[PDB]
Amino acid sequence: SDDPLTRPMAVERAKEWLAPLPPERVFGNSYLVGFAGLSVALIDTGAGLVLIDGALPQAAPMILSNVRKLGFDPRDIKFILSTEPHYDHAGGIAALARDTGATVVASRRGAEGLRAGAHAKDDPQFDYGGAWPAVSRLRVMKDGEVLRIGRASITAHATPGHTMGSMTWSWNACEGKRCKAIVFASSLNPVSADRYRFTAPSSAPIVKGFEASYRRMGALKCDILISAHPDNAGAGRYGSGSGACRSYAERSRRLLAKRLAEERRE
Ligand SMILES: [Zn+2]
Numbered sequence: 001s002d003d004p005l006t007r008p009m010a011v012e013r014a015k016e017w018l019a020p021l022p023p024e025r026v027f028g029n030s031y032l033v034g035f036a037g038l039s040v041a042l043i044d045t046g047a048g049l050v051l052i053d054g055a056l057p058q059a060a061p062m063i064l065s066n067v068r069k070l071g072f073d074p075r076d077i078k079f080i081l082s083t084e085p086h087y088d089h090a091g092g093i094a095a096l097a098r099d100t101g102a103t104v105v106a107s108r109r110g111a112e113g114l115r116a117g118a119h120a121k122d123d124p125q126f127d128y129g130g131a132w133p134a135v136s137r138l139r140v141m142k143d144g145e146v147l148r149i150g151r152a153s154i155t156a157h158a159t160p161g162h163t164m165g166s167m168t169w170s171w172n173a174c175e176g177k178r179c180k181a182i183v184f185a186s187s188l189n190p191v192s193a194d195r196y197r198f199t200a201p202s203s204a205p206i207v208k209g210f211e212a213s214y215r216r217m218g219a220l221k222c223d224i225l226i227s228a229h230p231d232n233a234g235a236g237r238y239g240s241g242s243g244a245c246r247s248y249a250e251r252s253r254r255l256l257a258k259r260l261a262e263e264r265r266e
């Protein structure tokens with residue numbers, strides 16, 4: 001069995017990214033089933049399960065194992081939400097969709113990258129090239145659109161900048177009468193291949209994209225923040241409490257400012 005959808009990528013970086021963690025309940029019906037360096041969430045909606053992201057291709061079996069350790073059947077995963085079409089977050093999604101029958105859910109631009117399993121021309125990391133497992137079974141959400149399943153309501157928020165189709169997901173998780181607003185934030189890291197310039201006129205959609213993302217992340221109700229790379233939000237697997245999403249955005253803003261200045265230095 002040479003499985004195209006799980007054949008490993010980035011095996012050296014994966015030693016850190018995929019370091020194991022026990023799966024844990026976040027709050028309510030919502031759980032973490034990812035790794036030390038890459039977040040994967042699992043929502044039990046009462047009418048099926050929803051996963052958020054899929055890590056690397058070889059992570060798909062590890063994710064399904066974690067889902068089982070929590071007592072769930074992966075055959076009940078109905079949707080896999082995608083924050084971005086890069087192989088460290090989408091790499092395992094095709095395998096997960098194959099094995100579960102789930103529909104993959106993304107932004108319009110995100111879906112285009114998922115279908116291709118390759119970088120789009122306006123992706124800051126286009127020049128890195130490469131290919132990763134492509135996805136075909138795709139549902140596009142518009143910015144502000146809500147996915148309702150079981151008793152859960154998940155809102156899609158376009159949060160471009162890292163790529164044009166990067167997308168953040170929010171929903172409420174409840175325990176008895178107490179509910180918390182959870183945000184699973186796409187990366188906002190301004191990184192690129194070597195020759196890419198964020199200050200080029202052709203990059204303006206990406207830079208205006210970051211500005212819209214900062215405004216969105218400042219507006220969200222955000223009792224709990226799960227960052228696609230959890231170290232971007234700090235120590236531990238998620239951050240909580242007033243201000244988390246705003247701090248996350250400010251971190252990105254500071255990195256972007258530093259990057260723009262770097263490009264404007266002689
Ligand atoms: Zn990325």
Ligand SMILES: [Zn+2]
Pocket residue numbers: 086088089187228229
């Ligand atoms: Zn990433």
